[PDB]
């Protein structure tokens, strides 16, 4: 209420306090009496209901911090001109349709936050704020930046994510101290060649734009720690780019137009831990490209145009997670046995009819996803996958399972739905750790084995669209809990 605000105002002037916190008090109008509190250096008014800041705030000539986020402001009074020491101005989450003209006159500012307003224009007069080291105008409606952005030579962070930019002014290259430049979720058709002038750049946000190419000069930004180009129109990378990014920890080329790996050979991948290339049109992985990729442990090639794997596929000994889903692979080579560090292998939605015996040598394999292939059998050597917890075989052409399936000590999840299974093996009962067993949509599955009752942790079982005609018809009407209870009691394992 007005009273508790006046009390805090009186308390502030009675302590001669240099900070005033009136945040989160549902204030609609701030009393004029605040003008008397001229000793304030910090004023916090965020998360209130302010539709205007009173002109009297201009009397607080010693303010260095004015925090106004999460109000309903549409402007600021010209009296803020008097705030000749203000360093930080927090205006995010208001209702600004422009930067208020007085803000362009607050040349002491080093930090200006304007996230999530409705601003359409950054006027040429932005040049007046040459002390700015942090400028965030993310989540507005800005279509263009003026060339005058280049007179902000002290910028360290510039965040213009979620705007409508089609280009960047070449004068951005005068902002030589920028380490964090976020342009993601704009409409950028290109980047200026001067981007390479930003030699201290370590974070560069470019995902979700309309880019067709990356400037060769980006290779001068050798402090980049990630390069995420997801969702653009890129199909190549410029000469020697990736090998020049000596601190690159990850690379994302997902959702682009690549048909081949970027040119430059194995040296472009010697520093990254992960490589994400999903949703392109890549038709081949070059022989030898990972020969220098000593720390690369995660490779995502999902949704490409692979019809085979390179002859040195088994040399990828440091790979831990490998996603090859939604390609056109018809076989996995025997040399898969070389991938002794592999823990996750996703092969969903390919054209696989059989699996190699070498698959059984994947001793660390924890998750194997073969959903939506054409598999007519499993090799006996799957029995040696003692670390396997999740085996997804949904939607294939399996008729029987190898008896060795019961040797999968650690298996918890077995997806067998949408197959041609005529029966489960009795060895299913040695799967002591099985929890989820999906059998739905197996139209030739007319019985279940007694030894399924031996699976003590079995808590999820689906049998929809399974005839199960050898069991009592009233039991299958009772659902899985009834079927498993029947197998226990009438079975000889109790």
Numbering used by the authors: 86 to 579
Study authors write:
The MRAS–SHOC2–PP1C holophosphatase dephosphorylates RAF at serine 259, resulting in the partial displacement of 14-3-3 and RAF–RAS association. SHOC2 bridges PP1C and MRAS through its concave surface and enables reciprocal interactions between all three subunits. SHOC2 exhibits the expected LRR fold; the 20 repeats of SHOC2 coil to form a solenoid with an extended β-sheet along its inner, concave surface.
The unliganded domain adopts a similar overall structure, but with a modest change in its overall curvature compared with SHOC2 in the ternary complex. This degree of flexibility is seen for many LRR proteins. In both the apo structure and ternary complex, the SHOC2 β-sheet is disrupted between strands 9 and 10, with bridging water molecules inserted into the otherwise regular hydrogen-bonding pattern between the parallel β-strands.
